[PDB]
Structures are given as structure tokens and as C-alpha cells.
Amino acid sequence: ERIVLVDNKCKCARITSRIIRSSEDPNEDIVERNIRIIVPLNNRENISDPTSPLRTRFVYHLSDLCKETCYTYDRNKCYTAVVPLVYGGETKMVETALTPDACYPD
Amino acid sequence: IRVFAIPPSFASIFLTKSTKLTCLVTDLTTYDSVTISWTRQNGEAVKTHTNISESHPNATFSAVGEASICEDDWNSGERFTCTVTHTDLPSPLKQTISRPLHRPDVYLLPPAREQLNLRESATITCLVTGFSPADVFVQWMQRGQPLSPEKYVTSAPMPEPQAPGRYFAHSILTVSEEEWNTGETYTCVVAHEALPNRVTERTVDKSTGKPTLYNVSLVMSDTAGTCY
Numbered sequence A: 001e002r003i004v005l006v007d008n009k010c011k012c013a014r015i016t017s018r019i020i021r022s023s024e025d026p027n028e029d030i031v032e033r034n035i036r037i038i039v040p041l042n043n044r045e046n047i048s049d050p051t052s053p054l055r056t057r058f059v060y061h062l063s064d065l066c067k068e069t070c071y072t073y074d075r076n077k078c079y080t081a082v083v084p085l086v087y088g089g090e091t092k093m094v095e096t097a098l099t100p101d102a103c104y105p106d
Numbered sequence B: 001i002r003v004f005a006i007p008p009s010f011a012s013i014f015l016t017k018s019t020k021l022t023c024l025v026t027d028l029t030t031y032d033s034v035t036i037s038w039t040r041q042n043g044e045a046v047k048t049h050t051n052i053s054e055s056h057p058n059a060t061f062s063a064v065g066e067a068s069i070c071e072d073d074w075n076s077g078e079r080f081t082c083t084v085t086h087t088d089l090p091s092p093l094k095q096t097i098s099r100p101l102h103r104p105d106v107y108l109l110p111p112a113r114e115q116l117n118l119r120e121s122a123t124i125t126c127l128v129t130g131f132s133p134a135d136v137f138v139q140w141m142q143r144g145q146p147l148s149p150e151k152y153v154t155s156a157p158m159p160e161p162q163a164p165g166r167y168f169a170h171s172i173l174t175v176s177e178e179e180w181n182t183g184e185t186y187t188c189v190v191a192h193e194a195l196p197n198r199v200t201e202r203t204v205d206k207s208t209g210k211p212t213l214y215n216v217s218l219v220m221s222d223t224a225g226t227c228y
């Protein structure tokens, strides 16, 4: 019945609308605007930095995603980071990961 | 005796893709041996002109000429001089014409709720303002199918009272009042010379409008960060 308008995974905002069919009444149908927002709560500011301060201002511009730092992560997108480790005397720079089951090469 | 040469309009370029200039030599005496000729400023002629007109009921002869040119040969600034000859004019009269930007803005205005209370008919108005120059063609389509020419009429261009160098155009499409049960898409497509693709299609259905109910179901969880 309803169709999906916006399914962006950056801000994790789901925008959709549905028309409700009433009884045999005049043309006074009610139009709705379904919005789904998931608060990250326990997440960092930068996308590739786990030492960022905890989020405090959750600003969501509804007029900007219907035409950029993303709070929520993506299951189908891999996130990598580099941290300087030693493990002895040589300072190597390996590539790390942020989310499980999302960075396995094909 | 009147001589007028109407320049080709933009409506015949986006749809027919064949520009043509014609000079009217109507309201003249009823005599034969009338030849239509176009003289350019560089020394080139035009193609064969056929399909002449008949005589008016008021005992005046009418003629029509054809001159097929290219689109690039009109916007550069080439001037065409149409010259004709007759018996009453010792000298061949000549009439020369020539052509003397901002991105267009398209807005669709849904009908008010007072019109739908009568349960008689509904009108859809697509407001197009803030564009230059004038003479813009506006057409309506239904799911990719153009409608009848007599179903919609494009208003004549009018200078904007506020903007010193912009114009606005209006276009209405009256349909049945009960047609809103589905929507029939009812896009608004305009063609202007100040666009790369010259295609601006906007759709406003029943669902797309001013909703009267909002329920932002927001949730908070400690393990958030996946967005299933």
C-alpha cells in the first residue's frame, strides 16, 4: 500500500507516506508523513575515529536529504582505520576494521 | 497593402525541430505572377516553396512562402530579407527581421480545498516564473502520453512586476473532480533554451502535498549504530 520515498542510510532516516481510505464520506482524506529516526546514542563524532567525544547534539535536517558526516554506520559499507602499533621495535601501520561481517573481500 | 514577417517561435523548435520564416503579403490586389524570394546578407538562397494559399472572399490575393534553415543559423544573428514583387509596386518591397539568460523555475500549485467541495471539477495550475526571454512553450503529459491540445492552454508571457528583466508564464489543466482518487501522475514539463537538456519534469500526486499528521517514531537504544 505504502511506497518508500527516502531510504538514506547516512542519517538513518526513513521517510514514507500512505493514503488512508475512509468510508463513503466526502473527499477529506488524511495525509500522513511517516518518519523513522534511530538515535545513535553511543557513537562517536568522526566516522573513522573512536576517541571522539560522545554525541550530544543530534541535528537532522529533513530538507537536506530530499535533494557530510553520517552518525549511524552502514552494514553494506566497510569502515577502516589505521593505528600505530609496535609489537617489538618496528612501528607498523596496519589497516583495522570498525564493524564485523562487513569487510570480507569477495 | 500590408507586409509582416512573423519570426519563428520556440514552440515550433522543441517539438517540430524545423525552423521556418514566413512573410505575409496578404491584403494585396488579385493578380498572378507573384514570386516569394529570400535574400540573405551573404549570398545564399532558400529551398523550394510550395503549398500556396487561396484568395480571400474580400477580393484580395494571399501568398505564403517557405524558407527552411538550420537552428544554428538563427541564434548567431543572421538577418533574412524577404522581398516580393507585384504590379502596383514599382520597387520590390523588403522586410527584414532579426532576434533582439536566467534558469527557469517550475512550481506546481495544488488546487485549494474550497474547489473540491463543489464535487464538479478540479483544476491544476503549474506556476512558472523567473525566466528570460519570453515565448516559452508549456505542455502537459500523462504517464508519458501527451494530452489533447484543446485540454490545456498556455498563457501569454507577461513581464514580472518585481523583476526588471524576468517573465512569468501560467498553465492550467482542468480535469474531473473525481480524478484525484488515483492521481493520473499529471506532470508539468517545460522547455526553455537556458537549460542543457531542456527538460524539467515535476510530479505532484495526492500523497505529495501538505500532510495533516506527523508521527516521528524515534527510538533510543544503547546498542544502536547498525540501522537495520
Ligand SMILES: *[C@@H]1O[C@H](CO)[C@@H](O[C@@H]2O[C@H](CO)[C@@H](O)[C@H](O)[C@H]2NC(C)=O)[C@H](O)[C@H]1NC(C)=O
Binding pocket: A046, A047, A048, A049, A080
Ligand atoms: C575525521 O574525519 C575526516 C573526514 O571528515 C577524516 O579525514 C579522512 O578520513 C578518511 C577515512 O578513512 C581517510 O581515509 C582520509 O585519509 C582522511 N583524510 C585526512 C586528510 O585526514 C579524518 O581522518 C578523521 N579523523 C581521524 C583522526 O581519523
